[PDB]
Write a protein that binds this ligand. Structure first.
Ligand SMILES: [Mg+2]
Ligand SMILES: [Mg+2]
Ligand SMILES: [Mg+2]
Ligand SMILES: [Mg+2]
Ligand SMILES: [Mg+2]
Lengths: 353, 354, 346, 353, 344
């Protein structure tokens, strides 16, 4: 199999409702959609959905980088995922969204050529994944309200965004728990809003509310502080912004910085790198959660789902980006329907047309 | 695709040259060969190469464990390598030879179902790999003659065991270097022979003859000493016995114990674990080499070759077992012909058959 | 004295409760006619060793030690380590038989050659997992037999674990010591949670709460709970013991002859722990029998720092594979006697 | 003073000759030129010159980011450099080129409003800077001849690029030294080409060639390895890629990772952040060198020159980007002339246009 | 077996060149008697013969009625009596092991590991004019000694001189081990060893003060020359600390430092586990009994790879019959006699 040409285009899909997190708001899912065509006719789909608040990547820069990558991989075999990443890494020192776009398309092609769904090529542990649904930052009253709405949709795990103020963040969680009961799993994401000392205080304050885990409580670069929080509370602590790629994961596992790591294809540059992160973590007894950017759509989410279903150590999933989309850019793959169960199917590769 | 049955057999292949080990010798390569048959009729080949003096793995124990694994994985999809290893790990806390046998056959089956050579499912970096060849221990003059013979065959890298006494080691290396010149790479395996400070002395003495690297100069469990050696000599130091699995690799790169890590499928329990080791090392900026057991053959070598060719960070290969076999236990895969370049071809999976 | 010959046979003893103990029994005979007994109890799920592999390894060891003196336990282990990079069951089988021979030649019970601190040891008894009611009923039965310490497996689910402990504790009172074995079932933070919940029922200690290779996680648990934490699977040999005491990973270390390859290595583990101020317990494998338990009992009685014992394998056997040694009768006190060596014959 | 409007445009200036480094080649200086106009009429000039091989930034991404910043700072006082950076950091998690473009324009405006050369506002230690000139990777004898050429131009310090191979890199240096003599200062830049162990071996090999310092011998992320090199050789070791911003500098000085740090406005996001880096370093007894991207032009170089001249602790300068430019995008500022002495003058602000 | 009585007496043996110890005889009800010795070195442990005698007497009465095989309880008893008295404890300990061998009717080395039945010891060269001891060197070598131990740290210029002469006198076939006796600061030790290294030095013993473990670790990490701890290691706890920190390459065991064979076994097994070899040494105040006990232990244990047991060589007479003789020879053969193979 050989790459004949690379097609890239912009996609701007408005979100049904503004997404509010500690870092700011997300109003639209703008992503670069890539199509890698082989000489034999098979076409693979990929997507680069940048989150300027997380990586600093923009749609314009992602588009330019993908074009540079595209003209560099013509003639290569999509199965040579090792060389493909080598080439992209020599071209750009940092562009996970653009790298993920090419990477996902190559894996889609691998599945199509092998005539097997992607999850079978990536580990085959399962053919479906159960995801939580994230509740954006809002008043305690409103948040609890939407929590009940989501539980009625079938969701047994809710991800609560916090990070405006320790006192207010605690009130939000209290209201949600009281409204949904203890049968529902609640995980929090502070998005680097607290100092390590304040983090410990806040986490202990919820000691009776049964919090599953707390995501990135402190600044992404404050590893000493993050390790401090993890060592001071029996609550599970997860790194998100503190872990972009495999090198970051290696550093975190070596230092025992956190208990769990959130993998995002748009942070690590694709499935190729995500596999590395998961295996490094698994080796250290650290489970992983698969996440997403609010800016990605069906393609990115479907790729993430196949990887999550395939790997045993990716025990949690936070793939709710399609639920907020006003429309879908391609057919097939993970639906726009807000539901916890994401079933992959038997179609080859991503199963997207 | 689903596993219908797992068949295992013993394999005994006479060696062209006997292998001398502590308190004994090896005259035949006796391993376990597995054939995993799917409901649709596709069959995958795997091998469990024992090595009692290295891993403690015996042929009898390996055969027994493979049988246990086999009956436990009936009904599973070969692509579900995640569950397959989960099942084997629940059954046995330690059995790298038996786990590799099942693992390799599953990957062979993956290639056959996908109709792709195995290296394409493992990274696809290349479709061939260059291997060194090991020179059996003998008098300096004899080893020198053998060295020239191998160079004539095209080999650009020779491997020899040291740690048999510095004078004897030096004598052999001296004769070899003088016989083939300085364009040929010389890899030494000290097989855990020295104490840390003695290792530094011996390595610096041998270094005068231009040495590419020295493998495992101290006991496998002496990580502090291994790191000491690595930090005191300019010569590249490689861990072998100190690294069996991914957890060992993580410890090694965390401590910055060595310059390179040698993977062996029969030490780590298969391709699945070998990938983890390579990814951990690559992330740490440490390259990997892949070697083989004295008691493995065509299947084990072929699987290792596909992995080495597929992965960029596996930059060295010591896969010469087929060159010392009196006859081939199977058809296809890496041939018995002594040549440095192992070209994999386009046959699906391992390209091996009865 | 010189070793004349080494014999080994597969042994299969039916267990009273689920199916059998499969081990390799060794007989080492000297030129002058003395015969020492040894046992290699595999544990595929713990060490990875199989009976077939253990038998093959023992045969290789046997051939290599012909002519050697059983007292040269230093060389005996040197030879075995040169032959096999890893085979604790096989090494233990040879090792135990050599110590038995040493005792017979010296005409002294084995415990006298191993420290001589005592000539008897008190063991706990493990209750088979079952309904909380059934387990409580058996606990009463065992206490009726004189057992003051009961051992039960946990990590099968917090609610199930608590139900069983609650039932047992309520039926026998608080005078009975309860030690739990978590069998590497929990993640570090889950372990702290589970243990503190179980702690309300007065727990003596918790064995291996996390995976054996997770030493950092194990140390975390130890440092976060008041309950005594014991390493089992995390400690196979002396090198493991040194690492554990060095990092202050646990409160106590559990020794098993089948994990360390015999009395020779077990003595090292105990001396290392004792020097670090860490007490040791000695346990057993589900696959071993009379010989292994007897050897362990002599070592336990002989060493002051081996303060606890979980040597109840013979109580679960339908029959004994040999004559003499620790008997099948379920009793807490294991009295060794004055017979030379292990006092076992076949 | 208040910002009225922000203008941004692309600039594509071909280099007189391709520049080759270990990471790759640079053939043109493509930068985003920013003009910030205030209500009163004063206009400040700034530039964002991204190096994809270093930060992964692209011209297209830099342009989009600057536009986002621009529409967010309307109405702010250019002197409120604290809030301006606050606003930009809230908008993007990473875009030093874009941030530097806005930052430099604000400092230019501060100078114009104060009617003082920028170097006076930034420390006033000096009004000129002496720079080295970099020799791109090439054959030993070719590099040597180029070195003699540069010395004839008045340069007393040459920066030698290496990173193709220990044996080859050593040969390059030997040839250059013997060709120019020991009266010329030679600093090396390996651009992360060597492993810690190989770096030490390579540096010791030149222990007779009088090497002033060695820049970034190992991978950017390998701090333990970088510290190892610094601790094993008496040769001065400088971090470049290992230090982007003040947080990176703090980590490096805390761990004693290196002896000197290379500051680049395009890595740290402008003068505001560069001052932080220099003061953190100065406090730890670590000197700094002011560097540049080959993609920058007169604006970026002039800004860097004023900062370097103003600060005592920025003791070295590697500002040779204008020397390779085919043309200049604006009037005034640092000339295109290849000369070691960069005199600043008395014109207010940057002294441009 | 039961201890009936413990007899202790002071012993004075005349030296050849300018040994006071306590000799113990433990008598069992059965009639067997074990020999032990406590050689106190006031300059090393601060122990005096008077204190050692008083302590041994306290130990003796407390262990009456105990089985000599219960070495675990015997040390327990002694430890509860005195917080520190290695010479006294070794005296009782050695006699108990002698009795164990007699009762079991086996040479002590068989009961301690049985790895070998002989040991090769080095010999110490008295410090003096470079040419003098150099002469004695060629002399000792003629006696069959392949390893010579030399005291250093009396001035780098003087040390290098004496070593140079000896080397050019006996050749490079003879192994030379040096004992710096805590003479240098970590920095000066590195420089000194650095200079002496050119003359092929097997190892350097205790180059820095006993309690400067950080400094000792430094020296060990800076020179490829083998560094051995002596005064820095008295007991098992000390050994554990040293191996945990990788402070040295080798540890010198002395029964008079650790309190007997029981503790010495612990030290050796702790070291062996960490890949650290042990040498067994002796005190200037010891004689036949102490040296013999040490020889049996060293012969029995594989990890005790070196021996510096030359105390009997400087004695004019022996306080007992049997055991290692007074003859200055490299080879110490133990024989088949039970226990220590020593009699009145
Ligand atoms: Mg997050
Ligand atoms: Mg090897
Ligand atoms: Mg247990
Ligand atoms: Mg640079
Ligand atoms: Mg000394």
């Amino acid at each position: 199999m050989k790459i004949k040409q690379v097609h890239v285009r912009a996609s701007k899909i408005k979100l049904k409702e503004t997404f509010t997190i500690a870092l700011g708001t997300i109003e639209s899912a703008d992503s670069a959609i890539v199509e890698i065509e082989t000489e034999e006719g098979l076409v693979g789909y990929g997507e680069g959905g940048p989150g300027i608040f997380i990586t600093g990547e923009t749609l314009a820069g992602t588009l330019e980088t993908i074009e540079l990558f595209g003209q560099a991989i013509i003639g290569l075999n999509p199965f040579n995922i090792e060389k493909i990443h080598e080439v992209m890494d020599k071209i750009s020192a940092f562009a996970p969204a653009a790298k993920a776009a090419i990477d996902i398309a190559c894996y889609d092609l691998m599945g199509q050529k092998a005539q097997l769904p992607l999850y079978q090529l990536l580990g085959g542990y399962d053919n479906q994944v159960i995801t939580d649904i994230t509740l954006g930052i809002d008043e305690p009253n409103v948040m609890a309200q939407k929590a009940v709405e989501k539980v009625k949709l079938g969701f047994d795990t809710l991800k609560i965004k916090v990070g405006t103020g320790i006192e207010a963040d605690i009130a939000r969680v209290k209201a949600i728990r009281e409204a949904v009961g203890f049968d529902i799993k609640l995980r929090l994401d502070a998005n680097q809003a607290w100092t390590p000392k304040d983090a410990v205080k806040a986490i202990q304050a919820l000691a009776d509310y049964q919090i599953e885990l707390v995501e990135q409580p402190v600044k992404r670069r404050d590893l000493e502080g993050l390790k401090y929080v993890t060592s001071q509370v029996n609550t599970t602590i997860m790194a998100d912004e503190s872990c972009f790629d495999a090198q970051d994961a290696l550093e975190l596992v070596k230092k025992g910085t956190v208990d769990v790591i959130n993998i995002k294809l748009m942070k690590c540059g694709g499935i190729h790198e995500a596999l590395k992160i998961n295996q490094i973590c698994e080796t250290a007894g650290i489970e992983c959660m698969i996440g997403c950017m609010a800016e990605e759509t069906t393609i990115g989410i479907t790729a993430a789902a196949h990887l999550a279903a395939a790997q045993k150590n990716i025990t949690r999933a936070d793939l709710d980006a399609t639920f907020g989309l006003e429309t879908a850019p391609v057919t097939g793959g993970v639906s726009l329907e807000a539901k916890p169960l994401l079933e992959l199917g038997e179609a080859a590769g991503l199963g997207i047309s």
